[PDB]
Amino acid sequence: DDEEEDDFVYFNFNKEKEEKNKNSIHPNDFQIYNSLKYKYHPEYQYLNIIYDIMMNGNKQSDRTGVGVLSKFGYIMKFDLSQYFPLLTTKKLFLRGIIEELLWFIRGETNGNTLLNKNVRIWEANGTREFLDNRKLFHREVNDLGPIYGFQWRHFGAEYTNMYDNYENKGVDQLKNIINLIKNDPTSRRILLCAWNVKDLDQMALPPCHILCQFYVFDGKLSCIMYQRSCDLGLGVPFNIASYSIFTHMIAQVCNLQPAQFIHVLGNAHVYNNHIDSLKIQLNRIPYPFPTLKLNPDIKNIEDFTISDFTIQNYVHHEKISMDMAA
C-alpha cells in the first residue's frame, strides 16, 4: 500500500520550515549523531533531549546574565533491572554523589561533613557571600539550612541550626515511605517531598529535585523523580545516577527488585557555555551501561556506607569540561 503515504504529506502542511526551526547550531557538526539509523541505547534519551533543546530551545538569560536555551517538560525512563544508567559519553565519578545521598539519609544539613570527605558539591552554596545574598545573615557558614536531609527526616519541625538534634520532631517521611512500601505496596501516596513551601527562604537554595513517588508491582519497585530546574550539561548526568542508586537502596531494604527509574524534567535548560562541549558529546557513541551492586547484608536504609556500593564494568569516553574555559 502507498495511498496513505500521500495523506501524510497533507497533514504536515503547517509544520514550520527548518530555517524557522529556531537555532542553527549547524547540525553538520553532528555528523555521527545524525548518521545513526537506530538509536535505541537508553543514553539517547538524554542525548536526544540535548539535541532537542539545542535545535528548538528558547533563548533566555537568567538573573545573572548567563544565557541558556530552555524547554519545558521532558520524561526519561531507565530499566534499572537491566543496567545502571551512568552516562558513557563522558567520564563521571560517583563517590561524591553517594556521600551526598548518605548525608541526606542521615538528615544532615552540615556542609562541613561533606567538605571533610573532600566532596565540594555544596561548598559554593554555603559561603558567607552566598548566604548573605540569600538574606541568611544569621546563618553560619556551611549551615545549608532546612534542605533535603532535614525535610526527609523532619519535615514540619522548626529549623534552628545544623548541630541541633531534631529527634522526634517533624515528619520522618523516609521512614514512612519505607513502611508504606512494605505493608501497603499498592498505596498511591508513597511520595517523598523536599519542597517544603514554608522553609524555602531558609534553605541555601530551594530543592531542584521536588519529589519522588514510588510504585510497587509483583515484587518490583519503580520510582518517579520530578525536577523543577535541570542543568542538562552538568547536573542531570549526576541526578540520574543519584536517584537510580537511591531506588536500589529503597528496593533492597524493602525486599524488592529495582524496576524503573522515571525522570520528569520541568524547566530543562542548556547553558550557552556548554554548547561546544555538548556537540562533542552527541557525536560519541554510547558504550553498554555498567552495573550497580549493593552490599546485600544492609537491611535498613540508615545502615549504608560508602564501601557498600560498587560500580562494575564502567566503560566510558574521555572526561569532558562542559566549560572549556581557561
Binding site: 537506530y38 537508553p42 537491566q82 543496567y83 553498554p288 564494568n313 574521555e318
Partner: protein, 221 residues
C-alpha cells in the same frame, strides 16, 4: 564501472566480543575505545559460560529470512552472474576450529545452510549435512548456485580477519559483552575509515552481565 560482491551476495558477519584481560593498567586511567571489546574465544571455546540473550539474538538474526524480498535478491544475483530468472534459509559460514567447538547436539545449525572452511578436512570427514570449501573463492561460487536469503560469517578470528581484509563484509552485527574474561583469540581491529557504526540497541543484562548489540556498515567515502 563495477558492482560489489558483498552487496550482491549479501555477505555479513556476526560476532560477540568481551573485554580483554589486560591486567597491566586494567583499572585506573585506561583509555577506552571500540577495540576494548575484542575477546572472541579462549582455548577453543567461548570466554564466558553462557549468555543466553546473545544466543537468542544470534539465532534470530542468522535464521530470519524475508521470503517476500528474495526475488528482488534473486534478480540481482542472477543479473550479476549474467543469468536469468524447501523453505528459504540463510547461509552460515564457519572456520574448522569454529565448527569443532560446537556441541554435537547442535551441529549442524538448525534451519541454516551450514558451510565450513577447511584445508585439512574434506567432505568425507563429515557425517553432517554441510558444505565443505577450501578457498574463499569457492564460497562465492557456492553462493551463485544456492537459493538463500543472507550469508553470515559466523567466525573464527582467522575467518573474520580474511573476510574483512577482502572487504567481503557488508555489515557487522557486533555484540558487546560488558565483562572481562580470559581470551587467546581476538576479533580483528576494525578500521574506522572502512566501517562505521549506524545502530546501537537497547542495553540488557543476561547471566550477570550487561550487553548491547551494534551494527557496523561498510563505508563508501
Amino acid at each position: 564501472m563495477m558492482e560489489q560482491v558483498c552487496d550482491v551476495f549479501d555477505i555479513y558477519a556476526i560476532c560477540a566480543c568481551c573485554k580483554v584481560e589486560s591486567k597491566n593498567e586494567g583499572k585506573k586511567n585506561e583509555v577506552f575505545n571500540n577495540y576494548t571489546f575484542r575477546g572472541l574465544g579462549n582455548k577453543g571455546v567461548l570466554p564466558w559460560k553462557c549468555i543466553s540473550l546473545d544466543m537468542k539474538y544470534f539465532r534470530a538474526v542468522t535464521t530470519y529470512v524475508n521470503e517476500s524480498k528474495y526475488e528482488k535478491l534473486k534478480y540481482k544475483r542472477c543479473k550479476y552472474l549474467n543469468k536469468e530468472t524447501k523453505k528459504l534459509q540463510n547461509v552460515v559460514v564457519m572456520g574448522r576450529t569454529n565448527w569443532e567447538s560446537i556441541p554435537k547436539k547442535f551441529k549442524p545449525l538448525s534451519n541454516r545452510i551450514n558451510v565450513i572452511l577447511s584445508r585439512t578436512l574434506k567432505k568425507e570427514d563429515f557425517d553432517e549435512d554441510v558444505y565443505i570449501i577450501n578457498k574463499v573463492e569457492d564460497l562465492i561460487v557456492l553462493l551463485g548456485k544456492l537459493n538463500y536469503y543472507k550469508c553470515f560469517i559466523l567466525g573464527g578470528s582467522v575467518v573474520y580477519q580474511e573476510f574483512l581484509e577482502k572487504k567481503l563484509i557488508k555489515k557487522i552485527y557486533f555484540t558487546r559483552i560488558n565483562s572481562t574474561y580470559e581470551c587467546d583469540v581476538f576479533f580483528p581491529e576494525i578500521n574506522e575509515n572502512e566501517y562505521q557504526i549506524i545502530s546501537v540497541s537497547d542495553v540488557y543484562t543476561s547471566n550477570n552481565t550487561t550487553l548491547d548489540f551494534i551494527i557496523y556498515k561498510k563505508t563508501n567515502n
